[PDB]
């Protein structure tokens, strides 16, 4: 009762929060672990992702040893603001939120021996650079790097509380991904060097693989069907000039519409992806199918076709015979090269 | 030991007045600045600004903060920044900026025994960049970042790049979505006025836009459509349905390309090189259809006009491309 208040008031008498524990005597060792409640959405346009974590930091401060009936002291956040705490920040964080609804989501616990546990709930938005050269068959390793902002390697070092594989724990229902598949995470620590000195950095990499089925149904299949439709015109009789002309131009318009829509579904990057080359090839095939018809029509001598009751009628063009084989063959070879190129990496 | 550091800090902060600059009555205090750029993102052509995150370090000497008997550099808690004097440094072209505060306010204060103070900040700032996009997408941009003192002239404060040309790091590690950083420059100069000279630092980049996507999605399809519109010249003049359907469908396709590139590309309300090229191809397919209308009127209301057009149209279009690509490259 009153002993609790006495111990609380006695703790901070003479304490100086401006100085890290063991300043000039030893290295302040911080043990950290992360529990990911939800691996939130990944934004391709902004090249960033959101993550909701329970961040836990533990360290020893001999200046806060206490003796009393209780073994653990739980500190109010106001009192927790009067005590030195690590200035841990995320190197690739962009705009993070420390929730304080309805109260500050922080918790400071002190054991009798002076060991402090500091747990906080955070929402971190971190940038994940992406190589979209293999879109939509790409895989990424979105990193999460954190460490001390002001204290060098000679003052504060971070370590994982348990074995690094088990130190970062992701909830079973954590994944909130529509377009990716969270395969796993790797946990490691390293050293960085800035203009202010050497720092210890704790890194966690989440490995994501994009789902391809949506682009197969929305983009790849309609483009393949449109190319087959354009090559179908090779089987129409050469005297149906308006029919094959309308077929060719309307297939070109259909391909243009599909190309535009397929590009609107891709984040705004200025380099060429795999789907850009696939659409460009389909565009080239439909263009060639129409130039081929222009060449067939240029040699059609007679304007009347063969009739069932059968006067001289035109024979089947050798260009059409060649194209009925070459175009499906060339398109099948392109498909095999494209898929074996990108699906085997 | 530790109590000695505590008393040293108490002595340093005893009688310190944050309202007075170092060497208040003497020479101006030299402030050295260096910037470590973490990333550049959201280079917006519509808003004419870019957003960058950087580690902004400032070094200056304050004899009031000189301590002896401790052979270590005292890295103190960031809240001690509220108890010291820091330069009134602001970014002139900044539109919206903030300092990250997770898990705490991302700033540092490191003291050296001779009195040198290191004051570091982690700042994400959206800086204005007026862009000339008349040559878009074959353009280059020059986006700057101005650093100035709000209320001090060159008699009170001075700025310089600590480390010279090596002051700014991380430029070569940046990878923008639709740009490519060519070079960056550091400029130190004084803004001379009647009242006095004001220190100013300028960090500038040169962005070169990548052209692969525009080649694949804008120029090549328009060229293919324009070439397709020439097929009408090799069909017999009496095939009215075929030639009219081909001409008006190529016009519809060109309109579809123009309007969808209008929606897809950023809203830049003035004439660009992409608009001139799209309009040129639209005019060419319009004239290709008007040629057939003229031929049909001549014949009914003739192989020479078609033979002439089969050469003139490819030649004129090739000359237009040659002039276009020589003008903007």
């Amino acid at each position, epitope marked *: 009762t009153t002993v609790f208040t006495r111990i609380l008031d006695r703790l901070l008498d003479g304490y100086d929060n401006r100085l890290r524990p063991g300043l000039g005597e030893r290295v302040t060792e911080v043990k950290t672990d992360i529990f990911v409640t939800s691996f939130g959405p990944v934004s391709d346009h902004d090249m960033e992702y959101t993550i909701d974590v329970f961040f836990r930091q533990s360290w020893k401060d001999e200046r806060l040893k206490f003796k009393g009936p209780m073994t653990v002291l739980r500190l109010n956040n106001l009192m927790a603001s009067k005590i030195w705490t690590p200035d841990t920040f995320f190197h690739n964080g962009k705009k993070s939120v420390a929730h304080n609804m309805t109260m500050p989501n922080k918790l400071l616990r002190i054991t009798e021996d002076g060991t402090l546990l500091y747990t906080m709930r955070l929402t971190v938005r971190a940038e994940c650079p992406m*190589h979209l050269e293999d879109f939509p068959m790409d*895989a990424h390793a979105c990193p999460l*790097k954190f460490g001390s902002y002001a204290y060098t390697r000679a003052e504060v070092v971070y370590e994982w509380t348990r074995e690094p594989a088990r130190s970062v724990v992701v909830a079973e229902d954590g994944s909130r991904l529509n377009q990716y598949d969270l*395969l796993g995470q790797t946990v*490691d620590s390293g050293i*960085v060097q800035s203009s202010t000195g050497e720092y210890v950095v704790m890194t966690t990499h989440f490995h994501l693989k994009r789902k391809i089925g949506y682009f197969v149904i929305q983009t790849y299949l309609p483009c393949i069907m449109t190319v087959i439709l354009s090559q179908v015109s090779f089987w129409l009789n050469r005297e149906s000039v308006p029919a094959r002309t309308v077929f060719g131009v309307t297939t070109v318009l259909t391909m243009t519409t599909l190309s535009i829509s397929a590009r609107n579904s891709l984040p705004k990057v200025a380099y060429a992806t795999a789907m850009d080359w696939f659409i460009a090839v389909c565009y080239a095939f439909v263009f060639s199918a129409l130039i081929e018809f222009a060449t067939v029509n240029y040699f059609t001598k007679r304007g009347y076709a063969w009739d069932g009751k059968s006067k001289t009628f035109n024979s089947v063009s050798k260009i059409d015979r060649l194209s009925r084989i070459a175009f499906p063959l060339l398109f099948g070879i392109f498909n095999l090269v494209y898929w074996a190129t990108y699906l085997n990496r | 030991n530790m109590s000695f550091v505590k008393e040293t800090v108490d002595k340093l902060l005893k009688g310190y007045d944050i309202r007075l600059r170092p060497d208040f009555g003497g020479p101006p205090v030299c402030v050295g600045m260096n910037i470590d750029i973490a990333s550049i993102d959201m280079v917006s052509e519509v808003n004419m600004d870019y957003t960058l995150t950087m580690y902004f370090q400032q070094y200056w000497r304050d004899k009031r903060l000189a301590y002896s008997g401790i052979p270590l550099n005292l890295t103190l808690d960031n809240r001690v920044a509220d108890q010291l004097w820091v330069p009134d440094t602001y970014f002139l072209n900044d539109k919206k900026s903030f300092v990250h505060g997770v898990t705490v306010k991302n700033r540092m204060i490191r003291l050296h025994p001779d009195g040198t103070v290191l004051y570091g900040l982690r700042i994400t700032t959206t800086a204005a960049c007026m862009m000339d996009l008349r040559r878009y997408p074959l353009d280059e941009q020059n986006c700057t970042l101005e650093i100035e003192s709000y209320g001090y002239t060159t008699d009170d404060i001075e700025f310089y790049w600590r480390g010279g040309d090596k002051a700014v790091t991380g430029v070569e*590690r940046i*990878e923008l979505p639709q740009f490519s950083i060519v070079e960056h420059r550091l400029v130190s100069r004084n803004v001379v006025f009647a009242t006095g000279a004001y220190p100013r630092l300028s960090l500038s980049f040169r962005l070169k836009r990548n052209i692969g996507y525009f080649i694949l999605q804008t120029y090549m399809p328009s060229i293919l459509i324009t070439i397709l519109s020439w097929v009408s010249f090799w069909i017999n003049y009496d095939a009215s349905a075929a030639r009219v359907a081909l001409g008006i469908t190529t016009v519809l396709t060109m309109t579809t390309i123009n309007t969808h590139l209008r929606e897809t590309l950023p809203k830049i309300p003035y004439v660009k090189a992409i608009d001139m090229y799209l309009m040129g191809c639209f005019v060419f397919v319009f004239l290709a259809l008007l040629e057939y209308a003229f031929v049909n009127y001549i014949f009914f209301g003739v192989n020479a006009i078609d033979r002439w057009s089969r050469i003139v149209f490819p030649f004129t279009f090739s000359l237009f491309n040659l002039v276009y690509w020589l003008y903007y490259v």
Partner: nanobody
Framework: SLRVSCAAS????????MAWFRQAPGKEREFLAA???????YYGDSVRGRFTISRDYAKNSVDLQLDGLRPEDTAVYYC?????????????????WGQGTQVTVSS
């Protein structure tokens, strides 16, 4: 003191993880060091504090500084670059591999 370089051509590795690997004769391929886009340096236990990795982003190259060499280090050294998919220490995560260099140490 020995310095080993690794020039990269045909592709800019600004946003790729550039690493060094050691392959003892017949044993296996051993991870030595790495550096990602953010200049974070990773090292193996056997070479922690001994080897230094540095990246020349302008010249698109990665250098390795070997100090305190031992007969155990006599092996083939490779230069690797990859996205670090499924761990940045596994050799299976790296795709671009150098032709290799032979280092022989005699005392």
């Amino acid at each position: 003191s020995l310095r080993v370089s690794c020039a990269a051509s045909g592709r800019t590795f600004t946003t790729y993880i550039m690493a060094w690997f050691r392959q003892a004769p017949g044993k296996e391929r051993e991870f030595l060091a790495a550096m990602d886009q953010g200049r974070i340096q990773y090292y193996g236990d056997s070479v922690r504090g001994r080897f230094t990795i540095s990246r020349d982003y302008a010249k698109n190259s990665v250098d390795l500084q070997l100090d305190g060499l031992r007969p155990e280090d006599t092996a083939v050294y490779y230069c690797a670059a990859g996205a670090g998919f499924w761990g940045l220490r596994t050799a299976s995560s790296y795709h671009y591999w150098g032709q290799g260099t032979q280092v022989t140490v005699s005392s």
